[PDB]
Design a protein around this ligand. Structure first.
Ligand SMILES: CCCCCCCCCCCCCCCCCC(=O)OC[C@H](COP(=O)([O-])OCC(O)COP(=O)([O-])OC[C@@H](COC(=O)CCCCCCCCCCCCCCCCC)OC(=O)CCCCCCCCCCCCCCCCC)OC(=O)CCCCCCCCCCCCCCCCC
Ligand SMILES: CCCCCCCCCCCCCCCCCC(=O)OC[C@H](COP(=O)([O-])OCC(O)COP(=O)([O-])OC[C@@H](COC(=O)CCCCCCCCCCCCCCCCC)OC(=O)CCCCCCCCCCCCCCCCC)OC(=O)CCCCCCCCCCCCCCCCC
Ligand SMILES: Nc1ncnc2c1ncn2[C@@H]1O[C@H](COP(=O)(O)OP(=O)(O)O)[C@@H](O)[C@H]1O
Ligand SMILES: [K+]
Ligand SMILES: [K+]
Ligand SMILES: [K+]
Ligand SMILES: [K+]
Ligand SMILES: [K+]
Ligand SMILES: [K+]
Ligand SMILES: [K+]
Ligand SMILES: [K+]
Ligand SMILES: [K+]
Ligand SMILES: [K+]
Ligand SMILES: [K+]
Ligand SMILES: [K+]
Lengths: 557, 190, 676, 27
């Protein structure tokens, strides 16, 4: 079992590192404002038709561009979900959503969270799924990658004020990274057995005489983009547990590869754009060490599993409850760690039915800020916030000015880094406290006691951290839960995006001073261990009391 | 004021592409290339759809192969309400359900081991698990053989015929398609 | 000034009892601790009479130890401020009084006037005699003797001051030995760099450096996340079982927030300034001192800074058509009027060794040509011979302007003069060249080791000279510097400032001349000399009282020590919190969650004892780390990665380990004392 | 839920406002 787990981790990381390097070079070309080969001409005439000029905005107009696109998508998706009974492609004649559910789903799919407090096959029509949900799966991912493009450009640019063209960045990302790769992934999913059609719900005569209604719809097209853009918004309520979304083990391997593909490629692109690939390798070493430790812990916990199974007459204590039979507990543990570290809401298995440690480590991995490949762009700039914290600490301990990649770290960047670090744990703690003092927030619990508190804490952490993965035993379809979680997603996305863009606008004006003999190498095992220690220690000192009142209490029960 | 037009133009173009070209091209290419597995992987005999090859149906008969328990709403193995039980380890309801399932499976399978496979007493993640392990199938061979008047050799051969394996042993598990297994059993009987 | 004097400790403890009400809210971490202490005091009063909990003794002990934590943090801050004030008051106790000799005319012996100290302004002329205290700082316009600066510098050996030379300005409060010095006042008393430093120390309104501000922002953010966790712990346990008491939450919050560095930040800053004062360096503010730890290049003037100056004629090579009794006469005629110490030495030794004292010094038709740094010219047109002298390039320029040419013997002679390090200087009649007079310069002494230490620090030291290229090379090889820059105009030094700042490299420099004012103005580190002029001292952000060129070693030492003390104490405070969790969380959750008692890896006695031990350790770590913050961390010159690794291994691992031992020992002491 | 809970929530919000003020206006 341990050998199989080691082989699975090694194969997954090897294939991911092989695949993400050419995509890293392509993303570096996109950062450096160099058009991809073959895209010249058609990109120019498309920009001329769309009316985007050769202008190059600063951080204020770049952030206003991203926020305006996100608010326009939010309004369009909210009205689409509210008035979905007038739009076509509704064979089940599903009614329009309530105001709270529509607002929660709209904010959820715009903030790259993709929390779902509903069953897709019962709630949403085909046109809604393929026309608001899929376009927001593309657009939120493109917005996150555009923000990290701005941050990387700020780190590589010398004493300028501009930050690139935001519309050009969004169009380039969506058209040349998101759409064709998702097209290939969706075609492979269809080949393996995933669903892609527009037929009405097929009636099935069961062999024993029952009658089950099979849901249909363009499942694979949304599945490819929810894998690629670290989105995780399931077509059905089962999410990636559903055989129409993830039919095979090869499909699930491609799913995990697509989840980690763009954050790793963004780390490679960052290292190549700055010229020193050792920086990107340092970042990847930190995330890979934390990820491997977390994966090993979660597979060990799930293999230990339910201790009552041998007492109640079972072959093994293997925690197969709430896990699909086509995937092992090792594969389910790996997917759980990948999605809860990578800010993806996809679940191969119901995390509520996981053991105490195997639910803590995913929930703590969300709670540390989603820095272990934590989403498209979002993980990279959260890791950048932790890198500025680490280089501030390192510069203090060496007696020099705080320094990263030739650029000084000053009072304004420390203020904005501190605020961006502060936004998400504040939301998690206050939202969980508000849910825990309210009967509307406590009546949604399913399991009693420390695991119910784990349910509430997991929901608030996934909402504020733009993850969207759920225990799903919580009944978050109430108006109180919908509004609270929508507020958490909105603030935890945009109040972290805004100070990151402010950091970028503070860092464009500075000049990258060359290295010297006394400078600190921001790479190597010393800085990898320092950054890992900073991330784990900050997340721990924030969230150990919550874990102690939740999953640690359940484990020690 | 000269900044609203690029926002609207980019949003309408990206919405049009990623909501009417990428899904349209995906659907067209899927229906052209992989039509059976794009339309549902439906097992159709004549004009009647007996079930998808991926969803799995609620089998409670003595002569059929029983799959994993389902925790969907309304009837078990309901595809309209897919989702697991979401029951914690510390929840006494999970222990009660496991005890009831173990007792029911021991009553249904008297000529077998007293250590029931874990997937037969643990509910799946989706509630639509069409798959069990060949170990669970081998545990269920005596009951099916007694009910259908077959032999262990033919049952093992048919299970291995309808067994699926991944490319490498660690990315998944060896599984058997329960629905196609039961249709094969019915076609063998008549 | 000792380590902890009895009178200083006993007075500043009363100061700590006096800085309770409104000195706390300027520090956010300590204001949080103060608010928690007041809240726990009110909770304990309610528990004693008016609230349903009956454990008033436990809440009273928690409140008392929180007040003790505030008292020890203010003890650190007040002890640092008291040490700085004691050093400033000891330096203030000079004999500068109302005894002065005002002169209406700047000649010697004018009216023997007596004026008080307040009746002095920017423009005044004062006279001093043997054993006289200097009233006010200023350049010396007449006379020259030895000035004992022991009361200001801290070390004896009177310095030699010359009228309007390299050693022109005089430090106030310093005794005068041997002859008299007629002194013109430069800046009015009360407005002196020493007075500004004394006023900055006494009544400490010290401005925070940007590094301290950023660290304060980081500590505030940690305080916010710890306050959020502590505040949200009440409903989280309230739903699970019996709600955790408010006093335990406040105790955990105080134990969690960066109490150590948050209470020792001002102590670190003031102790760094006091250690700067103890190295005989006056600093305007801590910004320059902290920036000095980031500099990578040091600029150096030759004469005055790296050498004592006072060049004297040693070899005196004549020419073919000069022979004897002509070169000395030409040198005296060219140097009788310029007010430079090398010129005065040439005047007083040329007649001495050639018996040419019969030449008159005043002839009623002297041109009185001064000396300009860029022109490098000196001489009096007294008999239509228009005699001049200067550097080699200036002599070549003046010969090529009026005279015919020069032969190779002049180049050979100036090369032979520059062979042993003495700077060349040759006189010309105007149409013909003459012999070369040498000017021997003495190196300051044991500076090769300090330049090797600067090279080990990674600071590329480089000296800007002017003078002649080969003798600059000789003196650079003798001193042990990395590079040199000869033939430099005064604009070239500012050009080098802007060239090094254009690379982004942070530039330090030292100087003592009055022509270096834009250089010290544009420089990031502008360490002046005590022998320098008042204009240079005012333009510089720092001034050295030891008259030492390589005082940047000690300045870099102190700045790096301040920054590493701040970072190390922050790392220690952050790393203590895992042991704070392991002491408090199983203790805090004992009735609502008795299953959490497995987390008590320290095997502590009771939950109340564990919480009390955590609070006691949080209170006592500040008073245990007062000496570390006062002395600074041990700075050793290594590479950046090795220094970071050593500081991490000795501070982060220390904060990982030491609080476990401390809390365990406090718990065992409480158990064997029977208090809890 | 009660007067004590209201007072505690108000005190925590006041301390949070003071700390955010100190972070934004850290002179
Ligand atoms: C246990 C505690 C914690 C554990 C900690 C471990 C953490 C995880 C480690 C991973 C960290 C990632 C590092 C950053 C990324 C590095 C990328 C890179 O550039 O690499 C070069 C980098 C620097 O070297 P360099 O010479 O400077 O090269 C730089 C040049 O730019 C490049 O020069 P070049 O171009 O000449 O090089 C050739 C080229 C390669 O050629 C190419 O261009 C690629 C294209 C090839 C053709 C494609 C066909 C063949 C490829 C097959 C895959 C694709 C198809 C598959 C088919 C299926 C369809 C999907 O380069 C690449 O593209 C390299 C990328 C691929 C290699 C990276 C492998 C990293 C993952 C390691 C495996 C996992 C180990 C840990 C997991 C298990 C732990 C439980 O070196 C590394 O490879 C670093 C990684 C070292 C290995 C890690 C081993 C860790 C310890 C093992 C575990 C043992 C302890 C467990 C105990 C057991 C108890 C349970
Ligand atoms: C709480 C504090 C605790 C104590 C702190 C004291 C720190 C020192 C610890 C020393 C003891 C460790 C000794 C074991 C030896 C292994 C490491 C080694 O060789 O170097 C030792 C190394 C010093 O290395 P260095 O100074 O860079 O130069 C020596 C290198 O050998 C020369 O390497 P280089 O600079 O030339 O570059 C490396 C080169 C390659 O050159 C070589 O290394 C030589 C050739 C060897 C071939 C192998 C290279 C290929 C890679 C294959 C597999 C590598 C091993 C992977 C295993 C990882 C499993 C965990 O190529 C690369 O660039 C490759 C990428 C570099 C990454 C490779 C390994 C990274 C993973 C290891 C660190 C992650 C775990 C740490 C967890 C700690 C967290 C608390 O020390 C550490 O590794 C430090 C780790 C622990 C740090 C803890 C700090 C925690 C943070 C403090 C708390 C938070 C602060 C508060 C902030 C909160 C804000 C309010
Ligand atoms: N009293 C003097 N008479 C003639 N030339 C002088 C005198 N003092 C210095 N010089 C010339 O000026 C050059 C140095 O100029 P500068 O550096 O401005 O003065 P200093 O060396 O006193 O700081 C030397 O090369 C020297 O030849
Ligand atoms: K997501
Ligand atoms: K989801
Ligand atoms: K965090
Ligand atoms: K974050
Ligand atoms: K965070
Ligand atoms: K985040
Ligand atoms: K995300
Ligand atoms: K982030
Ligand atoms: K995220
Ligand atoms: K945090
Ligand atoms: K923080
Ligand atoms: K502390």
């Amino acid at each position: 079992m341990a050998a199989q787990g080691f082989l699975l981790i090694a194969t997954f990381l090897l294939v991911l590192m092989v695949l993400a390097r050419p995509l890293g070079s392509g993303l570096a070309r996109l950062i450096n404002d160099i058009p991809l080969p073959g895209t010249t001409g058609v990109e120019r005439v498309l920009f001329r038709a769309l009316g985007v000029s050769d202008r190059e905005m600063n951080w204020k107009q770049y952030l206003c561009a991203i926020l305006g696109l996100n608010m326009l998508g939010l309004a369009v998706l909210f009205f689409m979900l509210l008035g979905q009974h007038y739009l076509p492609l509704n064979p089940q004649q599903l009614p329009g959503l309530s105001w709270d559910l529509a607002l929660n789903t709209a904010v959820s799919f715009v903030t790259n969270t993709n929390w779902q407090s509903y069953s897709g096959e019962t709630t949403l029509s085909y046109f809604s799924q393929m026309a608001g949900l899929t376009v927001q799966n593309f657009l939120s991912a493109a917005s996150g990658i555009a923000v990290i493009f701005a941050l990387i450009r700020a780190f590589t640019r010398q004493s300028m004020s501009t930050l690139g063209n935001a519309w050009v960045d969004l169009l380039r990302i969506t058209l040349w990274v998101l759409v064709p790769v998702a097209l290939l992934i969706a075609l492979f999913f269809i080949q393996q057995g995933a669903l892609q059609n527009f037929l009405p719900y097929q009636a099935v005569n069961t062999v024993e005489g029952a009658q089950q209604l099979l849901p249909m719809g363009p499942v694979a097209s949304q599945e490819a983009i929810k894998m690629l853009g670290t989105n995780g918004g399931g077509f059905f309520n089962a999410n990636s547990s559903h055989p129409f979304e993830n039919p095979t083990a090869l499909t699930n391997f491609v799913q995990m590869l697509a989840i980690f593909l763009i954050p790793t490629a963004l780390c490679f692109a960052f290292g190549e754009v700055m010229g020193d690939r050792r920086q990107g390798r340092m970042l990847l070493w930190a995330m890979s060490v934390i990820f491997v430790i977390c994966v090993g812990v979660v597979m060990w916990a799930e293999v230990q599993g339910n201790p009552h199974l041998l007492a109640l007459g079972t072959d093994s204590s293997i925690n197969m409850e709430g896990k699909e039979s086509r995937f092992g507990v090792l594969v389910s543990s790996l997917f759980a760690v990948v999605t809860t570290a990578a800010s993806c809401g996809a679940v191969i298995a119901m995390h509520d039915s996981f053991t105490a440690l195997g639910g803590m480590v995913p929930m703590w991995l969300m709670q540390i800020g989603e820095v272990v490949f934590g989403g498209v762009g979002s993980g990279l700039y959260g890791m950048m916030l932790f890198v500025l914290l680490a280089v501030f600490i390192a510069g203090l301990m060496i007696g020099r000015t705080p320094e990263y990649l030739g650029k000084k770290i000053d009072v304004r960047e420390m203020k904005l880094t501190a605020l961006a670090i502060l936004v998400t744990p504040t939301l998690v703690l206050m939202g969980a406290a508000l849910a825990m003092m309210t009967d509307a927030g406590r009546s949604a619990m399913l399991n009693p006691g420390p695991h119910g508190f784990s349910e509430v804490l997991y929901a608030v952490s996934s909402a504020a951290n733009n993850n969207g993965s759920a225990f799903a035993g919580l009944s978050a379809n109430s108006p109180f839960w919908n509004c609270l979680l929508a507020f958490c997603m909105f603030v935890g996305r945009f109040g972290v995006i805004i100070p990151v863009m402010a950091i970028a606008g503070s860092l464009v004006s500075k000049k990258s001073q060359a290295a010297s003999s006394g400078t600190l190498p921001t790479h190597g095992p010393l800085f990898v261990g320092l950054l890992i220690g900073t991330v784990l220690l900050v997340g721990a000192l924030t969230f150990i009391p919550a874990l102690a009142l939740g999953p640690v209490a359940e484990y020690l029960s | 004021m000269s900044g609203l037009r690029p926002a609207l133009s980019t949003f309408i173009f990206l919405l049009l592409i990623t909501g009417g070209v990428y899904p349209l091209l995906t659907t067209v290419l899927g229906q052209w290339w992989f039509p059976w597995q794009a339309n549902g992987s439906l097992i159709r005999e004549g004009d009647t759809v007996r079930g998808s090859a991926l969803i799995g149906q609620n089998f409670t008969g003595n002569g059929y192969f029983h799959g994993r328990p389902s925790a969907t709403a309304e009837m078990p193995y309901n595809p309209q309400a897919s989702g697991g039980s979401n029951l914690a380890v510390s929840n006494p309801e999970l222990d009660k359900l496991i005890a009831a399932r173990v007792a029911a499976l021991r009553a249904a399978n008297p000529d077998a081991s007293a250590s029931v496979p874990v997937e037969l007493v643990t509910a799946s993640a989706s509630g639509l698990d069409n798959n069990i392990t060949p170990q669970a199938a081998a545990w269920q061979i005596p009951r099916v053989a007694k009910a259908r008047n077959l032999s262990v050799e033919q049952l093992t051969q048919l299970i291995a015929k309808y067994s699926q394996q991944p490319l490498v042993k660690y990315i998944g598990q060896p599984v058997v398609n329960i629905v196609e297994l039961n249709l094969a059993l019915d076609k063998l009987d008549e | 000034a000792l380590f902890e004097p009895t009178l200083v400790v006993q007075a500043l403890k009363e100061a700590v009892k006096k800085l309770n009400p409104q000195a706390q809210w300027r520090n956010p971490v300590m204001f949080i601790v103060w608010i928690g202490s007041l809240l726990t005091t009110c909770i304990s009063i309610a528990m004693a009479s008016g609230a349903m909990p009956g454990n008033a003794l436990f809440s009273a002990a928690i409140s008392g130890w929180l007040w003790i934590t505030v008292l020890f943090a203010n003890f650190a801050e007040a002890l640092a401020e008291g040490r700085s004030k004691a050093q400033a008051n000891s330096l203030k106790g000079v004999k500068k009084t109302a005894f002065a000799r005002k002169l209406r005319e700047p000649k010697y012996g004018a009216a023997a006037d007596k004026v008080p100290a307040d009746q002095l302004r920017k423009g005044d002329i004062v006279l001093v005699e043997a054993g006289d205290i200097i009233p006010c700082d200023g350049e010396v316009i007449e006379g020259g003797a030895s000035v004992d600066e022991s009361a200001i510098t801290g070390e004896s050996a009177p310095v030699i001051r010359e009228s309007g030379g390299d050693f022109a300005s005089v430090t106030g409060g310093t005794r005068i030995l041997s002859d008299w010095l007629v002194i013109e006042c430069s800046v009015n008393p009360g407005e002196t760099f020493l007075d500004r430093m004394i006023a900055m120390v006494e009544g400490a309104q010290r401005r925070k450096t940007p590094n301290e501000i950023a660290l304060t922002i980081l500590l505030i953010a940690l305080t916010i996340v710890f306050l959020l966790a502590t505040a949200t712990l009440w409903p989280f346990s309230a739903w699970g079982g019996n709600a955790v008491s408010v006093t335990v939450l406040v105790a955990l919050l105080v134990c969690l927030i960066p109490t150590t560095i948050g209470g020792l930040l001002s102590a670190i800053g003031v102790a760094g300034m006091s250690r700067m004062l103890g190295a005989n360096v006056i600093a305007t503010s801590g910004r320059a001192v902290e920036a000095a730890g980031d500099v990578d290049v040091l600029l150096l003037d030759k004469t005055g800074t790296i050498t004592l100056g006072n060049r004297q004629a040693s070899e005196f090579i004549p020419a073919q058509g000069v022979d004897e009794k002509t070169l000395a006469d030409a040198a005296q005629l060219a140097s009788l009027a310029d007010e430079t110490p090398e010129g005065r030495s040439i005047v007083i030794l040329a007649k001495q060794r050639f018996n040419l004292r019969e030449r008159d010094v005043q002839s009623l038709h002297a041109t009185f040509v001064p000396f300009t740094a860029q022109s490098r010219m000196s001489g009096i047109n007294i008999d239509n011979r228009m005699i001049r002298k200067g550097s080699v390039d200036a002599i070549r320029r003046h010969v090529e302007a009026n005279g015919g040419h020069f032969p190779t013997d002049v180049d050979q002679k100036v090369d032979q003069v520059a062979r042993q390090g003495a700077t060349p200087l040759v006189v010309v009649e105007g149409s013909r060249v003459l012999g070369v007079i040498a000017l021997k310069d003495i190196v300051k002494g044991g500076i090769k080791e300090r330049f090797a230490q600067l090279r080990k620090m990674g600071i590329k030291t480089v000296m800007i000279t002017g003078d002649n290229r080969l003798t600059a090379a000789a003196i650079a090889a003798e001193a042990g510097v990395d590079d040199f820059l000869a033939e430099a105009t005064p604009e070239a030094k500012l050009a080098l400032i802007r060239q090094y700042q254009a690379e982004g490299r942070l530039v330090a420099m030292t100087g003592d001349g009055t022509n270096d004012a834009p250089a010290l103005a544009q420089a990031d580190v502008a360490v002046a000399m005590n022998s320098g002029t008042q204009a240079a001292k005012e333009a510089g952000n720092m001034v050295d009282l030891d008259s030492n060129p390589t005082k940047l070693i000690e300045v870099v030492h102190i700045g790096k020590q301040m920054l590493m003390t701040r970072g190390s104490l922050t790392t220690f405070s952050i790393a203590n919190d895992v042991a704070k969790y392991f002491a408090i969380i199983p203790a805090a959750f004992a009735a609502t969650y008795p299953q959490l008692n497995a987390l008590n890896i320290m095997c502590l006695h009771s939950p109340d004892s564990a919480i009390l031990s955590a609070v006691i350790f949080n209170a006592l770590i500040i008073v245990f780390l007062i000496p570390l913050a006062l002395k600074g961390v041990s700075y050793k010159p290594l590479t950046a990665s090795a220094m970071l690794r050593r500081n991490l291994w000795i501070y982060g691992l220390g904060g990982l380990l030491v609080p476990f031992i401390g809390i365990k020992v406090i718990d065992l002491l409480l158990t064997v004392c029977g208090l809890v | 839920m009660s007067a004590g809970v209201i007072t505690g929530v108000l005190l925590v919000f006041l301390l949070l406002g003071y700390l955010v003020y100190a972070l934004i206006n850290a002179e």
